[PDB]
């Protein structure tokens, strides 16, 4: 019984994306959501929908939506499947196995690759433990490999938390820029505020 639309273009035509460690988010509700529009548009690399059928999407009513945005290289996208481990899946972002929603991805090389390199995008290698599902880590502390107490000083056994990405067109398919937006949905007994195109 609402008419206003969801900001899908703003979600996707957004100029700037976040890094993998910090990413982005959107609590989306009280809007109309057209997915037959999106599903056959594929200005995207991957539609990988878990707990949901992509044909059903426009049919679906959703209580709320949460949106995540971050850019990755081609090799390590596969790590984002739940029940799988990877230096992202371990030390950048954890995905719950009982995930309802859909990950969407797309190479963005002419946008996010520059010949001199785009090192504003960060990639966490070290953490004392893997994160729990759906967690961010903006910590600015130097990682201690060994017993040496860094106390905020880099050096031996004192590591850079987030290595800067080298995105250039020189990058291979597995090293190019791929903007990725994950659409997490909750299938809960609640007012379905994100009803798709229906009557």
């Amino acid at each position, epitope marked *: 019984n609402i008419t206003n639309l969801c900001p899908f273009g703003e979600v996707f035509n957004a100029t700037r994306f976040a890094s993998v460690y910090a990413w982005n988010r959107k609590r989306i509700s009280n809007c109309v959501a057209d997915y037959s529009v999106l599903y056959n548009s*594929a200005s995207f690399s991957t539609f990988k929908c878990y707990g949901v059928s992509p044909t059903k999407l426009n049919d679906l009513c959703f209580t709320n939506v949460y949106a995540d945005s971050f850019v990755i290289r081609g090799d390590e996208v596969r790590q984002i499947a739940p029940g799988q481990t990877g230096k992202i899946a371990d030390y950048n972002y954890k995905l719950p196995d009982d995930f309802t929603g859909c990950v969407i*991805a797309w190479n963005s090389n002419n946008l996010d690759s520059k010949v001199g390199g785009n090192y504003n995008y960060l990639y966490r290698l070290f953490r004392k433990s893997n994160l729990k599902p759906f967690e961010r880590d903006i910590s600015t502390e130097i990682y201690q490999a060994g017993s040496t107490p860094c106390n905020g000083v880099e050096g031996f056994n004192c590591y850079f938390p987030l290595q800067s990405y080298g995105f250039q067109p020189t990058n291979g*398919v597995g090293y190019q820029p791929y903007r990725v937006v994950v659409l997490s949905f909750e299938l809960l007994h609640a007012p379905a505020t994100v009803c798709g195109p229906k009557k």
Partner: nanobody
Amino acid sequence: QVQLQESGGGLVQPGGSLRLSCAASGFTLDYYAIGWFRQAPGKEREGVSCISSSGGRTNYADSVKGRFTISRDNTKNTVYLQMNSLKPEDTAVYYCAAWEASRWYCPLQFSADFSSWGQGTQVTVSS
């Protein structure tokens, strides 16, 4: 269990003809648009051709237009590729991969992403 298997590649004489079929197992390739790609020794994967999920919107590379033909048996869940007027340049490894309708406007003329990567097959032309 998404598995794409390319078959029918090999050595052919210049001026001859050949056929590939890659078969899809574990999934419905019918919902998928398929691109056939090629990398030779010393060159990157080029866009040879692309066909829709329904087979209605198409692309051929300028180098392969008018000699090669894509088709798909959606009932039998495979995609076929007929090559005619073979040239020695065509010696290269092939893959077929799957993605969906990639823009406003239908056709698959533009490159896209290519999710299901098959093993690939070497098609050699020499005499």
